[PDB]
Design a protein around this nucleic acid. Structure first.
Ligand SMILES: O[C@H](c1cc(C(F)(F)F)nc2c(C(F)(F)F)cccc12)[C@@H]1CCCCN1
Ligand SMILES: O[C@H](c1cc(C(F)(F)F)nc2c(C(F)(F)F)cccc12)[C@@H]1CCCCN1
Ligand SMILES: [Mg+2]
Ligand SMILES: [Mg+2]
Ligand SMILES: [Mg+2]
Ligand SMILES: [Mg+2]
Ligand SMILES: [Mg+2]
Ligand SMILES: [Mg+2]
Ligand SMILES: [Mg+2]
Ligand SMILES: [Mg+2]
Ligand SMILES: [Mg+2]
Ligand SMILES: [Mg+2]
Ligand SMILES: [Mg+2]
Ligand SMILES: [Mg+2]
Ligand SMILES: [Mg+2]
Ligand SMILES: [Mg+2]
Ligand SMILES: [Mg+2]
Ligand SMILES: [Mg+2]
Ligand SMILES: [Mg+2]
Lengths: 207, 86, 201, 128, 103, 125, 180
RNA sequence: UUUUUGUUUGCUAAUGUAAAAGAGAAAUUAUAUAUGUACCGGUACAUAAAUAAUCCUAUCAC
RNA sequence: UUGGAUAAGGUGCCUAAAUAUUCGCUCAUGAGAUCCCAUAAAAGGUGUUGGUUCAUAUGAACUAGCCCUGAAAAUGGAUGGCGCUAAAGCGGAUUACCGAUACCAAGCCAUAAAAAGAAGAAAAAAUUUUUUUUUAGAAUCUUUUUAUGAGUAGAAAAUCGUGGGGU
RNA sequence: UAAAUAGUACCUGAAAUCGUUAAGAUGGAACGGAUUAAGAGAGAAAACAAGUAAAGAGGGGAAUAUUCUCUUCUUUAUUAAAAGAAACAUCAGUGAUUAAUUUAAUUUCAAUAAAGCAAUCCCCUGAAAUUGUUUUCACUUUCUCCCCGCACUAAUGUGGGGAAAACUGGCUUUAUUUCUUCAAUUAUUUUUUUUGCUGAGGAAUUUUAAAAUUAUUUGAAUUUUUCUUCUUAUAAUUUAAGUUGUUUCUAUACAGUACUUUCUUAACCCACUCGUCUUGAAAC
């Protein structure tokens, strides 16, 4: 579904009304009268195999390759764990500065694109959001120090969705790694963290 | 009636349409105009040039005439000055 | 003005403008060391400047000159005063800014080994037409009783020799580095080398 | 003639000129507020809908904003009434600012209060 | 190297101001090597954080931060106005601020 | 400044203190409106105390709502408690300052039965 | 196109005439070029001039035509002679000045500045009486004659006007005004 | 001096920073020219001439 | 109240905004610096900068800008200060910007006026039925709309509090 | 003694003023307002958890003494949810940016590569014989050449006097326009890159009706067009018909260093003793 007003063609996505609001002089009603919310529509630089810098996460500054446009707007990113250390990580388009460099532009890695695409497709949206039960379990560990952390980690590992995600990541790494390694400079770049220095003006940067 | 927003007509397409119904047609026309390829426009330029010649000449004559008049005026002024001096 | 401490070489500058430049920076939040304050130039003719100074001196407090306008006659001191004038020094922020400024005659202990900066929008060579009269601040100071001018000059001269010595060594080092670079450019990797060449290095 | 005289009398306090059609339309659209109610109790209501003006200006064969705009542009059979109906356009200050409100537009130095016949539209656009 | 920058450095200057009228609603920010209006505009949507240290711990820490949005450029010389979640303390007037790369 | 919490907007959290109440003991903070020539406050010079004015008033809709969103109702007795049986989500009980402890306890008990909030349950607790 | 260099003085050909009357069916039409910043200003100037010269006022006449004249060869250096009438604080004077420029409008702009600067003559107080292109054999003013030199050459002693990007208040090494 | 943990009866364990995120950068001098170098301030030869629009220094964990 | 955009004025720093651009003019051994405004004159000037009129590239006479002289009072001293001369001076022009409680857009408060008013299930959460909220109708009242809001002397209205009385 | 900080100056015991303690501040006032801040106190009635279950302590009401049911506190655990604050996204309102775009109109142009046309010539512009017009000589280069000065120049040149040409320029052409041009300023239009602030209200029939949009269906039109328009009919949607959604966080908390708020100093900016008579009071 889409609407084409003034020549924009905006594309609609079905949404659910969650918030309830008190009526003027009787019983409450749902806040949203609208049933379809216009899709995000990402910038004209976000692709499928470009390398991006994560600005805000724990892996702050790491250079990770983009994976899947994850339909919910925010995209999936991987810095092939066995090379960069970035896991199968969901991220918003804003918290990633995408570089003009594309992986599938290199002569060596371009041939393994279809497989990558397939893998990306296989990854889903609901496989990221942790179900409440897991959260509850995690919380339950609060009531020594490092032991608690360990327990939390274990719990995280246990999650079936999480396991699946991990597996997917591993598969991706297997697919991609050797080629990346072979392009040594590229590999190094992938590994390294992007840092601003006393010469990099940012506003004149075309990266 | 409870006042709602006050919706910009010039932008909010629907509102604009409501205000002025024929507007849609106009918009369509504009779009169509925008559409046409630049080659045609380029071609038309030659035609325009061809058509313009006489007009251009006329314009030149007019402007030339004006210039001449100005010159004459200047000359007259000079003459007057000379006379005064004398 | 995002540096830790800016050392400003005050030679060849035009006083008031320089002061103005300093003041804003100070306000913003920058430690400024105005060094070599004997060679700051004033845009008026020397005599005129002297006269002005005299006039200033004359305006003292009538009841008790222990208070009132302190006529600090050291060039650095003068500069400092000027800077203060262009500041809201009666508040707290202003005071802080003032404190942040440090003025020196010639070059002392640490500010010989630190990089000396120049303010191009305040230079005498860029702000005065070369048919107008200018005045060296040190000379002015001497005229209105400073005494320690010759000594300062001598010190400066001495320092210059040292600088020259150091400079020679630096030059040599640079040359060596260049040589090394030349040698090693062939020892890297072809593509990498090419890339380096492309990007100027 | 009378209008002209009036303008002259208040020349140094106003800027005026010939509005051009597009500008007028714009004014009607973004800044066009209208008086809706029984005479002397008006209420400043933004147009938005044609039924809002079709009640008062229905007798004079001018339904819709477009008609009103047309009337404004060229003094038709019914223009004065339309003008009356329209609330005084509460405009912004110019986005690039005035030259000088004290001096005239016709003054050789930068000014404003003259009869800017062809630049009035521009001014309006700036302050729309 | 321990720790990665990823932000442009800045100085949280005065409030938006007349000659003698305050306006605490906007702060003025000087961004390192940006000297013109055009350059300033690049940073317009970026997020700004004033991070500061305190003696008493709070959410278990000595460092807290106030966030802002960067609203508009400010006059010819690359300065920008920033609006913050809560107004900045004027103790901050000579302090450093961070302008992040996100949005 | 303004103090938004929920939809509850408070325009002026600061109390308007009497002019010079801070200068002479004999002048209490309780707002009094200054009269007479040369007031400075009356004249509204920059930098002085402000004058309370009708602009400051809270939206007709949320006015006497407390942070809880319930209008406070003072309660001296069970009988009074009763008018709010059909209003537990809109009025919240405060027990009168002069109520004896037993009576207060009783009132509290009643409130709990009614599901009505008590804003001062802890007095003499 | 540059928007900092431009001076918005244009030249307008204006034609107008007094409204016809029963007693004077065939009035006389008057034309002039007027140097002014916009078209309305030009018109006003024209009206003023009419008032000064003949019995005519804007109220009893009508503008017949307003043209706006663009320079025909806006990239050809030309030597302009100008005649002016100006008012000082002490009285009124006629004068002739010469300006080497690329358009009449530009010359006018130059002239206005010159009068402002050298005589403290404000725009209001000046009346341009004729600007015409002078051949190089009739150049009377030395500051224009000099320019008209054969293979003219001069060095560039002017101070660099850096862009407010590459303008910094702290400099590494003391800049040089010498250049070359 | 090095290490560890901390500064989460008026007291007797104890916190503060107008400014860390690479807060990097030592010729000198002239401004209608300077700097070296080599001889005897002079001569000859180089060299800077948008000079921080630069250079240096980063990420190569195990 | 929030955001915007201006006005007068400014934009070297104090001081938010130009050491902006652009063309001139000024050097002062007591420069000059913007309405009211906080003063300067007659008369000069082979100071420089333009001009005009004349004469044979000089000699005149004039003329007007800036500048200089004329220009001397008492506490110390005041373009507001610092300072400023390729101005940050004077006269322009060109942009850009900053800049009010003025303007615009939005909210809320009051006042004024205007519309208008003597019957009914909505949703969510649970698991087809329970639970959670409301389920309005107070005429100086309720709902909505628009405009407006300075104020001494003064007038009025609505409230608020104190001592007692009947209820 | 119930109570002596009810001890006969005796009920309550305010303020000024003073003492002790603590905290803080302090360069010729102090206080204050506006806005934060860091402290230091306070707090939970929005600032999370309804209910369900197991079993204690209580209380009730009803049905016809003891069945039922309603509950308030305690607990062991057990799932909500909502609520605010973020962040991002989507609208809409109002703005700030940097790119543009339509058909025009207004003596614009500029290249292209072949023909030419005239040499003080041409587009022009001068000086001369009320507008148009006739002719007069005046005006371009040059790294060209000659003669004089013989390197005389700021100049890798030159002062002067002369020659040359059409490379330069100008015009006239034949075509050409992404090699480069297609301006500028209005006219009328159509977008777009970033983006800041705002979200009021809650519509028992004007939160409808229409507009718009999507997929269909009938008939037309000259603007032959995947946004072509009207219109016959049907569903849906939002650009209508003022902000909702997603994910965090507070937090699986009962108060903590978080959150609220009172006080406290700071700090930036401002702020002159009130009353009073007065044209006018901060008034020496
Ligand atoms: O501002 C002028 C001035 C002052 C002083 C200072 F106060 F620093 F000594 N120095 C000045 C100088 C200085 F000598 F360069 F410092 C030159 C011109 C004027 C000066 C004086 C002040 C009194 C009135 C005008 N002349
Ligand atoms: O106007 C009706 C009405 C009727 C009657 C009755 F007829 F019973 F006396 N009395 C009313 C009253 C009443 F008089 F107070 F009883 C007030 C308001 C409306 C009334 C309203 C109509 C709406 C529903 C409530 N009664
Ligand atoms: Mg202005
Ligand atoms: Mg008075
Ligand atoms: Mg008084
Ligand atoms: Mg405002
Ligand atoms: Mg502005
Ligand atoms: Mg400033
Ligand atoms: Mg001075
Ligand atoms: Mg100034
Ligand atoms: Mg009033
Ligand atoms: Mg007792
Ligand atoms: Mg007692
Ligand atoms: Mg008693
Ligand atoms: Mg007693
Ligand atoms: Mg040719
Ligand atoms: Mg709402
Ligand atoms: Mg003050
Ligand atoms: Mg009197």
């Amino acid at each position: 579904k889409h609407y084409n007003v003034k020549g924009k063609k905006k594309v609609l996505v079905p949404v659910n009304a969650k918030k309830t609001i008190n009526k003027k002089y009787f019983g409450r009603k749902v806040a949203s009268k609208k049933k379809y919310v216009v899709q995000r529509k990402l910038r004209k630089s976000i692709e499928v195999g470009k390398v991006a810098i994560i600005l805000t996460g724990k892996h702050m500054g790491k250079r990770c390759i983009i994976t899947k446009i994850l339909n919910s707007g925010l995209l999936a990113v991987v810095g092939p764990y066995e090379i960069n250390g970035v896991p199968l990580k969901r991220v918003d388009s804003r918290y990633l500065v995408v570089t003009s460099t594309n992986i599938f532009n290199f002569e060596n890695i371009a041939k393994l694109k279809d497989d990558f695409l397939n893998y990306a497709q296989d990854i889903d949206d609901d496989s990221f959001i942790k179900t409440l039960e897991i959260k509850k379990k995690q919380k339950k560990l609060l009531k020594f120090m490092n032991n608690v952390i360990d327990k939390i980690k274990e719990i995280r590992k246990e999650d079936p969705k999480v396991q699946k995600l991990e597996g997917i990541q591993k598969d991706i790494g297997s697919l991609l790694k050797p080629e990346i390694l072979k392009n040594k400079v590229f590999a190094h770049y992938l590994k390294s963290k992007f840092t601003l220095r006393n010469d990099m003006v940012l506003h004149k940067m075309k990266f | 009636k409870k006042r709602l927003q006050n919706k910009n007509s010039l932008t909010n397409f629907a509102v604009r349409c409501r205000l002025n119904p024929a507007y849609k047609l106009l918009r369509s026309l504009a779009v169509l105009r925008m559409r046409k390829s630049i080659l045609e426009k380029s071609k038309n330029k030659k035609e325009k040039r061809v058509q313009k010649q006489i007009q251009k000449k006329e314009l030149q004559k007019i402007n030339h005439d004006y210039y001449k008049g100005v010159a004459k005026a200047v000359k007259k002024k000079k003459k007057r000055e000379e006379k005064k001096a004398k | 003005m995002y540096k830790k401490e800016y050392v400003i070489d005050c030679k060849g500058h035009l006083l008031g403008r320089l002061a103005s430049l300093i003041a804003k920076e100070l306000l913003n939040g920058q430690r400024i060391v105005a060094v070599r304050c004997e060679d700051i130039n004033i845009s008026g003719s020397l005599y005129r400047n002297k006269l002005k100074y005299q006039e200033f001196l004359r305006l003292r407090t009538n009841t008790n000159p222990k208070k009132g306008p302190l006529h600090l006659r050291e060039p650095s001191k003068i500069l400092w005063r000027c800077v203060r004038g262009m500041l809201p020094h009666k508040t707290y922020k202003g005071q802080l800014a003032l404190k942040k400024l440090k003025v020196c005659v010639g070059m002392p202990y640490p500010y010989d080994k630190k990089k000396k900066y120049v303010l191009p929008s305040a230079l005498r060579a860029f702000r005065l037409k070369k048919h107008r009269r200018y005045c060296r601040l040190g000379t002015l100071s001497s005229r209105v009783g400073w005494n320690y001018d010759t000594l300062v000059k001598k010190n400066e001269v001495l320092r210059k020799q040292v600088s020259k010595a150091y400079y020679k060594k630096k030059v040599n080092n640079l040359n060596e580095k260049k040589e090394i670079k030349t040698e090693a450019l062939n020892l890297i990797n072809p593509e990498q080398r090419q890339v380096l060449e492309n990007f100027g290095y | 003639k009378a209008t002209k005289e009036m303008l002259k009398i208040v020349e140094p306090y106003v800027t005026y000129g010939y509005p051009t059609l597009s500008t007028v339309r714009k004014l009607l659209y973004k800044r066009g507020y209208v008086r809706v109610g029984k005479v002397r109790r008006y209420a400043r209501k933004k147009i938005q809908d044609n039924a809002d003006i079709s009640k008062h200006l229905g007798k004079y064969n001018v339904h819709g904003i477009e008609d009103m705009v047309y009337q404004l542009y060229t003094c038709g059979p019914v223009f004065k009434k339309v003008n009356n109906f329209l609330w005084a356009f509460k405009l912004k200050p110019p986005r690039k600012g005035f030259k000088a409100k004290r001096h005239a537009f016709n003054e050789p130095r930068p000014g404003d209060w003259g009869n800017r016949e062809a630049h009035i539209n521009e001014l309006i656009n700036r302050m729309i | 190297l321990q720790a990665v920058r990823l932000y442009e450095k800045g100085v949280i200057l005065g409030y938006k101001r007349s000659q003698r009228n305050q306006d605490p609603n906007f702060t003025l920010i000087s961004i390192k090597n940006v000297n013109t209006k055009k350059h300033a505009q690049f940073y317009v949507g970026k997020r700004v954080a004033y991070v500061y240290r305190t003696t008493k711990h709070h959410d278990g820490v000595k460092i807290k931060c106030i966030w802002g949005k960067v609203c508009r450029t400010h006059g010819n010389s690359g300065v920008i106005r920033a609006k913050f979640k809560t107004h900045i303390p004027p103790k901050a007037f000579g302090d450093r601020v961070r302008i992040l790369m996100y949005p | 400044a303004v103090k938004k919490v929920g939809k509850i907007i408070k325009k002026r959290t600061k109390k308007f203190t009497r002019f010079q109440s801070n200068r002479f003991m004999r002048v209490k903070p309780a707002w009094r409106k200054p009269r007479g020539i040369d007031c400075r406050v009356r004249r509204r010079y920059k930098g002085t105390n402000l004058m309370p004015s009708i602009g400051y008033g809270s939206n007709k809709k949320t006015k006497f709502l407390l942070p809880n969103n319930k209008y406070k109702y003072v309660v001296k007795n069970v009988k009074e408690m009763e008018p709010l049986i059909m209003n537990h989500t809109k009025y919240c009980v405060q027990i009168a300052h002069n109520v004896s402890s037993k009576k207060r306890k009783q009132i509290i008990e009643r409130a709990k039965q009614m599901n009505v909030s008590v804003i001062n349950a802890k007095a003499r607790l | 196109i540059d928007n900092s260099l431009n001076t918005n003085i244009h030249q307008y050909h204006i034609v107008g005439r007094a409204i016809p009357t029963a007693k004077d069916k065939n009035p006389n039409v008057y034309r002039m070029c007027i140097f002014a910043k916009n078209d309305t200003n030009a018109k006003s100037r024209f009206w003023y001039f009419m008032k000064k010269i003949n019995k005519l006022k804007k109220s009893n006449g009508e503008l017949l035509a307003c043209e706006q004249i663009k320079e025909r060869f806006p990239l050809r250096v030309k030597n302009y002679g100008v005649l002016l009438r100006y008012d000082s604080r002490t009285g009124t004077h006629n004068m002739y000045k010469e300006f080497r420029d690329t358009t009449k409008e530009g010359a006018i702009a130059q002239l206005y500045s010159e009068m402002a600067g050298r005589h403290r003559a404000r725009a209001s107080s000046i009346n341009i009486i004729r600007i015409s292109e002078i051949s190089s054999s009739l150049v009377r003013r030395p500051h224009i004659k000099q320019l008209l030199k054969r293979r003219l050459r001069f060095p560039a002693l002017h101070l660099p006007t850096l862009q407010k990007e590459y303008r910094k208040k702290f400099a590494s090494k003391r800049p040089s005004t010498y250049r070359m």
